[model samples]
Target: HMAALDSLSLFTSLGLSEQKARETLKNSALSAQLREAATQAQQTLGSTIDKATGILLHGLASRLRDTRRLSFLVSYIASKKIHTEPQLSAALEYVRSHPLDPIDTVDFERECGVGVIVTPEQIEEAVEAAINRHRPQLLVERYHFNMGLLMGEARAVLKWADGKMIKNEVDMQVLHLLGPKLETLSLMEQLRGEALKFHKPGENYKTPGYVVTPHTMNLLKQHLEITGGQVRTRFPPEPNGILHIGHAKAINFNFGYAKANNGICFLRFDDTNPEKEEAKFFTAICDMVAWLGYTPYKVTYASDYFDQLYAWAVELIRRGLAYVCHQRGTLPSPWRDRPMEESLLLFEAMRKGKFSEGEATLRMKLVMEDGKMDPVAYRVKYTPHHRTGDKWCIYPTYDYTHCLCDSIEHITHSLCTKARRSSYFWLCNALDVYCPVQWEYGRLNLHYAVVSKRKILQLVATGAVRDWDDPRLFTLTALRRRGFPPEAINNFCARVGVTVAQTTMEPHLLEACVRDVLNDTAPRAMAVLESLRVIITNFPADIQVPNFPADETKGFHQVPFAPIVFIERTDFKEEPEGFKRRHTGYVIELQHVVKGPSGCVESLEVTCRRAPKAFIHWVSQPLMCEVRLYERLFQHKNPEDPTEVPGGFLSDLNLASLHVVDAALVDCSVALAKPFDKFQFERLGYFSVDPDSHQGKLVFNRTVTLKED
Candidate 1:
């Protein structure tokens, strides 16, 4: 007992926490195993037991769960003689690729049977024993388990383990210390709470204090106080067009702010205008929201309140806040002062298709101080709606429908872009009902880009862009198909923040966020976008290179190295910059030489008299691919500006925005690249596999430039 107490004091003095040291030293089994490691480490390391103990702890600082389980790894490392860097790297690689399950235990045990190895089953049993021993008194019902929650958890795990494996010297043995717990999705446990937040790789985590309008802030505060801290917001996007970067900001303001307050967000599609709305856009909006790591409390639509809105329109007319009008353009209304009975008759006639499209409109009578003319509440439209088939000929305008829908749903905060502030207030006051707080945030605008749905449609119609989902466009579908991670967009939104400051962001910032995400996630590979035949007179045996740099855990793939390889044409210049690329007696690697994982020329023996300006990427038996590199669609930084434009926005067209590389050749690995699989074309920009890819032919679209300069 005295010796044990002395050992505990010794362990504590050596930097172990007092509690940890005491617990380990007090247990007979744990202490015996720890002492065994200390003894063996001393013999193997040619050091004293105390020094060995210190080294073991240093290595086990993170891997150590408790001292009892620490001995198994110490013993394994000692017995296998894995002290060398290569051996440990290999061990980590093995563990990462082979996440052990019940079936893996026997094979793992057999492979490492040289020494006394602890089977994975044993670790599983130990975890089970610990968990069972400390089972929760109250376990939530498991039936609530869902894929959205599971995916959220998986993303969390990916984020948590992101740099962990790299920082730990690729040693994944520490993961086994948690054992069976790895199988449980810990992130999913947040289902018990309404709010959840995921931090980025190195975000300075702090709650955001919003700088909103004084009235808006006070309203939100009062709601929180009344409800004991809860907020309800909604992201109501029209399904007529794909959401742009601006919508990302709106989503963040709505869902992100609500989640921050332990509240719920509704994904409500304002599909009142059925002329251009489609089911695909509706589905896509929800998909992107989920991809951004949010689950809407309820998916809704403005069309759902069509009936209620019609009834309320009548109520407004009865209250003398609205009247029937025959006004169009600057023309005076022929029925502005019509009696309520006559207005009701006209509205019923409008609904019954007795009026031609736009010939008759139900106008809301706003206060003179509203700073706007009487707005149209309902319009005569014979077009059939996607949701509600030909049931009515009249459609409620956005001004009339948006506020009423929010009122009906009891939304605490009706958030909108700065452009709609006036309309939002005018409609709410006209109704004279219990109004929710309406606030507006700046729309995210990217320079050198046009997110106008009208312009996008025109481009599609004229074949200037393939379609709305063209990678060059800023549409949400385009971004997703271009391999833009949802998290990156969310991060970008969070960076921009929710404020009333209306500013157009430089395209560089958006691409910077994209490059940041891809820098960590995109695998590295050499792709020859432009072909130049090169004969490697002295080619060696083909070798496998790591798919991504500094991450052998991602494994390796075979790159064909033959006597003849194809390099980019730009690589070799006849009179290139001196001492650079292909020069008459200069030796250079076949691949472009850049810092970090951007280069790929590790297997070839070439001695050309002159190397060009600089070494460029090449491929052996290259697979031919057609790559379309897209640039900014508009010519000027501000296409919408018409100060010096001859025609309109169309006159500022970038005729050469798209450059196609038909002769591009990629590595054989790209043959396995699926549609939407994104890769950096060596020194070139990032490209994504297009859906047009087939067994023999491959098509790729340039997602974004590594450097626009």
Candidate 2:
């Protein structure tokens, strides 16, 4: 017990808390082995104790169960004198790529190809050759030349050279070939030159209003003048509902574009309408944005500029660009040509709650490019705002607020899904404010699932799904609850790319990304969804299964191989074919099949004869768990499409979207799992520990099936 305490103390000294140290030391042998590996690495690598522990924890520790492999790795590092972090990192990468191969047979130098270092002379020669080959193009491009092309050409010849050395050579040779003119170009000029490449002819660039006409070129210059050439963007989601998968693309584009350009992105809530906006919705929006791995330059709200927006509306009224109207719809309001002073007075009255909801509205006088009449700029919404409270009854409409807010923030680009470009330009031009370019990208649409918050609300109200965060829904919160990593979601958006064409993808594409990520990250476990009892006449002791089969360095967990065990009910048959029996290490001869009153096979009694043909996963002394399986929420590909479904989306709901298997047996290796701990259930699927688990009971939600089928 004191030895166990000492081990716990050692782990705590290595940066783990007392509780975490105790948990890690639960398997004393595993802890001891890891400590030994860390000590060996520290001595061999000549690194600090903490650094050595980190190297093992991240690199070699996964193979700790294999003593020979660990010993070989330590000796190899020592023999090669791989002392630096970078060299050790390269060695680990080489080991990871050839994880299953024997360590002694693995040639680290041959595999990594990083051993053969190119001389400075070789790098210079390669750079000069590359520069000479592209001399004509370099003359034309001059300072605007893509230096990466030169780097690539040089790397092609000196493949094993250091990147920094290659880059330095390329820079020197380029200056020698192109003269010192390259040095005169500022960083901003260089970035602008690179930015121009995206707008070149023949490129499939399809962003609306991004043409390179003379008028747009002048507008771009003016816009850049105001922004000081900064690529400021904003993700302004309406805080009326939860963010869905479609929002992932928007988040990625706005935040990602700004990040790539070394600019800033604002997390702005379009909280103009008080009817649906709530504090919870606002909180959820920010949480989901941050969860997607973006730190907003500033958290903003439309209401934060409500006072400025209201003053702007009054200014527009005075300029005769807008007027207070009593009418609704496309027809010109009777008050359209009303006197400016009179309109301003009526708007003030509207703000004071003197007018009813439908009595008056402030409408812009300009018609949209779509031939629609004057659009409403502001309307009387008697509801109190979530942020500003009952300070005013008049609220700005999206058409009026969106552009002005972008202008006020000096945003360089306004990225959105909807085509409000005409209105976006109209209002900003009318008010004579600096108008940012509005570029529209297609909304990411998944076929089988509806991304509409209204439809999701109906599903929740009708008891079709548990809540907004239900595992079956495509809401970002729901995906997180369903054990979808934010990284996977971001990767899915990246794969989809930014384009103008509307793409309605199948759900499988996203599931494939999830599988790609989870396959590498989730630990492996064995589970039986529908158990068929099997009596192993010749049972063995507890069996150790690798938590990560592809790489055994991840270590092992134990599962009992007792007299009685259970396998998936679907795995067996009364008359077997090529299917393998459940138990391992012995050929099973079926003795009897016990039948219950329902005529179903209740249990199987078998005797071991010899070695088995194939092995199937089984668990004895297992932990009973509640496993929830999920199917697509809709049967039709386009459930929300009236033409396709005929019936409404709600009517197209799949009744068997969720299936809960109570009393499913899982190996005891997962007994210590907490909520959201992901695992691949051998043959079943990837599952996550559900928050519903409490006390001693375990509950799991199947994230995705093992394969698409």
Candidate 3:
């Protein structure tokens, strides 16, 4: 331990509490000194609970060596334990993206005090049913398990402690502090036991263990409380196009975070380029915010700050800070200066309409000789403003107006995504010309997703997507339509926390958070689309069927026996090991496979001899049904990756979506599934009855794959 604790004791002797000495010591590296044996136990939080001695009570078993992703996690826990709110917020975000856990995580979540949006009684009932094989076979049930555990992780906070919990008070907190490592090992055992209790029946998927840090849920609470309470922060988006998931993320982070913190995130469109500004796109940006669950603090525009920014610009000019140029009588007032008073008079002249569009732009009087030395403060763009109409001809650049607006609003922090490196710096420095301090963190970049609003707009323009709310896009509206619970998104963002460092926002994170929310709760069903038929030869043409319910269904149906049952084409392969099995959370054994217990082929004879080997999906004769599968619209990270090669790989754009399976029948249990109904396919993923559903045809959108493929 550092001598910092001794210094605290000295201070205490002079007049501080012994508690103070302990606290200061704990907050420093000292507390870790005693509990050093529990490092591995810290990976999954809830594990160290119910037990002690070797985890938190002991300390790290060894120097933890996990992936940078995982290392970042252990590191995150340590850092957060020592910080204040904002700093803690920054560190907690580090945990959300890189996730860990399983579905029954609900029980574990309640252990923490995060209010379960879905009641525990219901979760308890649901989780028990799905916990049959460690992880439920039903996709919806699995999702429920996933979500239950995910949200639970949000409340999985830990605190530093002396061996008191293990040695004396028998600390319930030992595990909370040990967290991740203990939770993972504990859960694996718990689920393994839960599965054994079920008699180790037929084919069932295994449960993937889960672990979460403390800040997950508190982050969301923080966001909602802060945003709804304060009227401070601002939202400044460029008026280039409609907002996408990436933008929604910005909203969730900037606007949402501000609101949750009792601060206001403004909605100021950085609409400098009038050439591309369409009235529709401009108005839609504001509508998007309202759609994103935010109330505008004020309907102010960056253009409205023109008068003040001009004066500030004049100060720079008058200080011998700017100049003007006619550029061979072409680009008028280009940064070819002369004097300060002359520039102010020129600005006044331009305000008086003495200059035509493209004829003049106020350039800042700067000395850094950086790229922004002769920055344009204002320009006459002749294009009418979306809200202002043709009333004003000049618009202030983000560099000039942003600072004034912050100063005007008395903002404490200028939050932003760390994507636009150069632009953010330029805008912030200009604001330092007169605004609050600025901060930036890594922007979200999905593994197989794109966030460029311009590219999305092109898709919209060309009719490639339905609109900004196209389910494929990551817009808040789109997510909302896709059944993305606001609380989940909010919680995920909070878990991701706050940051000033530039990092990549992973897409698995989005899925992981969503999966956490849907775990153990989403109902289960059987969907067989493109109905491939197969005959059960040895069954003697009759078997008593159980009327299983996909429980969460809005309707039901009866079943009768027939010659053949329908299975998915992908389910029956003539070749061996055609593809990796979709069953996640489990290990496969050769005895559990086809071709005489050797596990060689994908299919086997439907007769008694090889029947168990070729175990495939069947709707049990008269219970035949059809199902639909939707693939991502784009396959490449950047759909346009080959074209530019200038922007990063994330800039790639794909516009392809392949829906497998033609229409047929749905399992008898959920035949009555109406629009908006959701279910987990026993060994598949979570799917929902789409608006296209009816008595004859059934359509389902796989919400999130159960197996994280």
Candidate 4:
């Protein structure tokens, strides 16, 4: 009679309604099934332990009324062959020792050695069964979907079987149920990871399309018509100033196009101006190119082809395609009647320091009537070049040197902005040589930004900005320091297609691109920029939460919580509205204890009887540090515009751009943040460890706001 009412109790424990479980437990068919399974166990184990096993089976049948769970417990015994009790107990012990380890198929199969007709799926079942006997809770959450967790589940099966033997009917039944599902999930994840890395402008996961257009391809085909082999492009940045986002777009076009076609790109420095160019600038340009993820097939310089360019100039003089004139830079040169030999003699004398600066120059004789046409081939300048030195007094102008160098290098394309589109064919026609196809794309100009090197230098020289690498600037160094991942920049460049005409973009678009890329990658961290003390009536100091819940691969980190802690002052409010985190009489919970599926890291479970709307980030330890809040450099949308301000750009400069907080309490883990280390400060915003961080002092720079706006 005790068994009569007791059977229904077990059903309720397993989540069945007592009334329904009662009707099901007394059924004739269910009763016959457990009796048959018990008989099977008696026959498999023989006379040695049938008596002891019989008692356990009857006991489970009375208390565990759930049919599936009852069968699961009796599964090992209900097989044709069963392991000795000690052997099975040892396996249970082993599974308990190593918890949450992902299962490995090869290792599982290795222990199950020999006549194992069971497939890969069978191994996963046995593994789960072992874990169910040890720690059943872990199997309920399959929190992270990865190979590691799957492997952890599989190892339990091999451990239970003592690395040997089989229970054909029962074990195979278990394997048939669970193995296939595990393998399917694992294989699908692997396939997806290897397939789509990052989509380009015209491509995505389900779509099939080329990254570059037919227009770009036709240019390459035309290029192939003139030259053989793969297409070659050059990123010729004049090393007069630091490369900005404008240059990044051009660099992306030249190198990105070549890479798409499996071709090569050349990093050619157009450092023709000796007075403005510096060795440091050239080195920095090369570093930025590499940082942009392009290795130029060969590093070349326009100065490297000076001899060939000079010969071409003399050839132009002899062919009367060019003439020497006593005109200044912008004026029209009129020496067409002069003999070619006399022009050559003047050029040689000019090379020998025969004239003052800008006195005489060799001009390409062109019939076109546009401005900047009939360009200067060679100019009289006694200035010493960094690379060529004082050996030559005269230097070849870009108009004369560019096409000649492109012809010698067999460059397949000469890409530049629309401003230089006129020189595309003029230099090629004057030299009468094989010219690489020229394509001018719209340069990237960000709104509310100063891409001008002159203005940027002026800001630095006048102590208006920190340096070239100030976070307010768009220089590559500044971006890197601001914790902008390289992949995000490349991804942005890919999305923004190359086009003709000038395009001005909003700075927020770039910020949005960075946030998307980092959202998945950056690990979770807590910090309070504007510190305000808080007290938790009940909280633990040892417990911690997983650093990244969405990405469990990052695992967990220490997040100490205490009765008295610090929080962000901005989070506190007198009457918080819309999903209020904390207020008077409201209950909140800390992240240390994950409260099931509805767990929130921001809200802590504490009494708020005396509180207003205190939705704040609580740090266990007050690790106070210096924090820099960076905003727009200019108050006006266009600082360079005269209409924006009566005075120059400086008058419109935002004095409130950079703000340094003297002390802001943060989590202890923040103290360990390495240089340029980035983290999302709970709800505050994204920040990174600054280079100014020292052993005793910590400094951080705000990368961006968590709220996209």
Ranking by TM-score: 2, 4, 1, 3
Worst 10 residues of 4 by lDDT: 201-210
Clash total of candidate 4: 14
Give the runs in model 1 whose Cα sits over 4 Å from its true position. 1-229, 274-283, 326-360, 368-370, 419-433, 539-541, 550-553, 579-616
Whichever of 2 and 4 has more TM-score, that candidate is 2
Residue pairs in candidate 2 whose N, alpha carbon or C atoms collide under 3 angstroms: 62-553, 62-554, 63-553
101-169: candidate 1 lDDT, tens digit per residue: 332535544443333333333443433443333333212322222323323333332322222222221
Per-residue lDDT over 1-709 for candidate 2, one digit per residue giving the tens place of the 0 to 100 score: 2123377665665566678667777766668776766566556656544533444342455444445566666655544444333455566666556677654453675554535555665876798889889899998889798999999998778645556778877775665466545232222332331443333212212445433443444555555544445567899988776788888888887887776665578888888898654666768888999998889978898999999999888889878999888975465567888898899889888988898888898888877777887888899988777788888788999888888998788676677885546566766666666667766778777776777777777888999888887898888988888988888887787666655466767888898989898988888878878788887566444667787778888878877767687787877776777875443355566777789888788899877665535567778787889888888777676655585645676777768888879668888888888787688888767888788888488888889886655
Whole-model lDDT values for every prediction = 0.61, 0.73, 0.48, 0.62
Off by over 4 Å in 4: 1-228, 276-280, 329-334, 369-373, 419-423, 535-541, 573-615, 643-647
Candidate 4: global Cα-lDDT? 0.62
State candidate 1's TM-score. 0.62
Q: What's the TM for model 4?
A: 0.63
Q: In candidate 4, how many Å is residue 425 off? A: 2.9
Model 3 Cα lDDT, one tens digit per residue, 273-376:
55545666666777777765778766676666666766666666666655543342223344555666677777777777778776776766543334434556
Q: Please, what's the RMSD in Å of model 3?
A: 19.3
Q: Give all candidate RMSDs, comma-separated.
A: 14.3, 19.6, 19.3, 21.2
Q: Is candidate 1 or candidate 4 better by TM-score?
A: 4
Q: What would the TM-score be for candidate 2 when compared with the true structure?
A: 0.69
